[PDB]
Design a protein around this ligand. Sequence first.
Ligand SMILES: [Ca+2]
Ligand SMILES: [Ca+2]
Ligand SMILES: [Cl-]
Ligand SMILES: [Cl-]
Ligand SMILES: [Cl-]
Ligand SMILES: [Cl-]
Ligand SMILES: [Cl-]
Ligand SMILES: [Cl-]
Ligand SMILES: [Cl-]
Ligand SMILES: [Cl-]
Ligand SMILES: [Cl-]
Ligand SMILES: [Cl-]
Ligand SMILES: [Cl-]
Ligand SMILES: [Cl-]
Ligand SMILES: [Cl-]
Ligand SMILES: [Cl-]
Ligand SMILES: [Cl-]
Ligand code: NA
Ligand code: NA
Ligand code: NA
Ligand code: NA
Lengths: 269, 181
Amino acid sequence: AQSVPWGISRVQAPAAHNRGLTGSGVKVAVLDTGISTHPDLNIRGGASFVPGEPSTQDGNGHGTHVAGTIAALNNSIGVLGVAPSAELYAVKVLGASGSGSVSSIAQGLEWAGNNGMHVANLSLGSPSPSATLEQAVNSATSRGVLVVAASGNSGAGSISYPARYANAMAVGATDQNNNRASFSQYGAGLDIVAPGVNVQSTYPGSTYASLNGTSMATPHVAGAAALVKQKNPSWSNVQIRNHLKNTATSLGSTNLYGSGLVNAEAATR
Amino acid sequence: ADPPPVHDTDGHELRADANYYVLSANRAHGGGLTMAPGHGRHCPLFVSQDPNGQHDGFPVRITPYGVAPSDKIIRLSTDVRISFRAYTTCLQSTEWHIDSELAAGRRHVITGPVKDPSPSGRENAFRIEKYSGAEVHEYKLMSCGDWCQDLGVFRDLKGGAWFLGATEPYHVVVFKKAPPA
Ligand SMILES: [Ca+2]
Ligand SMILES: [Ca+2]
Ligand SMILES: [Cl-]
Ligand SMILES: [Cl-]
Ligand SMILES: [Cl-]
Ligand SMILES: [Cl-]
Ligand SMILES: [Cl-]
Ligand SMILES: [Cl-]
Ligand SMILES: [Cl-]
Ligand SMILES: [Cl-]
Ligand SMILES: [Cl-]
Ligand SMILES: [Cl-]
Ligand SMILES: [Cl-]
Ligand SMILES: [Cl-]
Ligand SMILES: [Cl-]
Ligand SMILES: [Cl-]
Ligand SMILES: [Cl-]
Ligand code: NA
Ligand code: NA
Ligand code: NA
Ligand code: NA
């Protein structure tokens, strides 16, 4: 039967669903290892930018898990996304190995701009700066994409790239007591946090799996953006971002948590 | 004096922080270097060699280990840090280190953090040396702590991933500058 993962209830998505906000009409791209067809997902399309790996199917599992946290279907099986009616696009920019180049990722962001994505979720990164990668984020942002990226798993006091670039919204991970998970990177670049420990979601072969990471936190925010956008279709990527921050539940220092815990109920009220 | 420089495939001296693919000197020996995960536990990713001579892998950024020298030319037989220009589901450092001199087992080159660094923590120090083969400018990679160890590739044709590590024959390489990047 369908379970509501605890992070879905923590971000208060069901209260948004009760006010008729499920993310319908919102285009969300998952820039990741691909998305496997799964009973509890609806994949509208996408593209691959990984040499040798032409399909948008997930040979790793990661992108499929991230996609379920955003948009796992509301039905009688598996789990439930923050935004179960969001239109999901699989943009493979990482190989099955789990790694991608500046160029794969940059072509994925260009794809998101050219196809009118409202949200791009990038649960991926590293400490490697790249001006070419920053330009691509800036370009997608100028074309209306809200770029949402994981703060990183190193535990350090600065955040990963691309999340660290100003026009990515950087997301850290919280635990079941609203504390920063110890791996979750923070710093001045951080915008907001979301659940990222024991996050059950969709997994290839019609399965489910419980992962920990800032990669799990990020889709909670990408989903909430989709809810805000459904409610306010004329809002820019910037207005959505500010509103998610303005309505977040403050948890302590902005350096450790940014605005605090994303709150889909307050964001859509 | 201070050691001679390492050169890229275009004859220019290697510079700190510029991006270079690490290609096999002999294309018959395979492709450039990438990252490959566990089968079970994905992260940390290992450094591996693409078996396909046509695949360049990810470029690497090379920086002097220790105090910053003024010119920024990468020199032979001089400790340097090496990290991939790449982005991962692991969201961890892409800097290389070799398995600790103090650990049991084979030694591989891996990326990311370690639980239990060695006292000196020199496992992230590598050197580029001249290969007595090198009709033209071709190199071997080594890691030195209390001994020096040249790096080769654990080939497997399964094939599982071809892991870089303490094994001979050594992996002879060349550095190709990433095209305007
Ligand atoms: Ca479901
Ligand atoms: Ca070998
Ligand atoms: Cl749960
Ligand atoms: Cl209402
Ligand atoms: Cl499409
Ligand atoms: Cl495609
Ligand atoms: Cl494929
Ligand atoms: Cl089920
Ligand atoms: Cl660069
Ligand atoms: Cl630039
Ligand atoms: Cl930061
Ligand atoms: Cl709590
Ligand atoms: Cl299946
Ligand atoms: Cl599970
Ligand atoms: Cl790290
Ligand atoms: Cl071993
Ligand atoms: Cl070789
Ligand atoms: Na940012
Ligand atoms: Na901040
Ligand atoms: Na679980
Ligand atoms: Na030579």
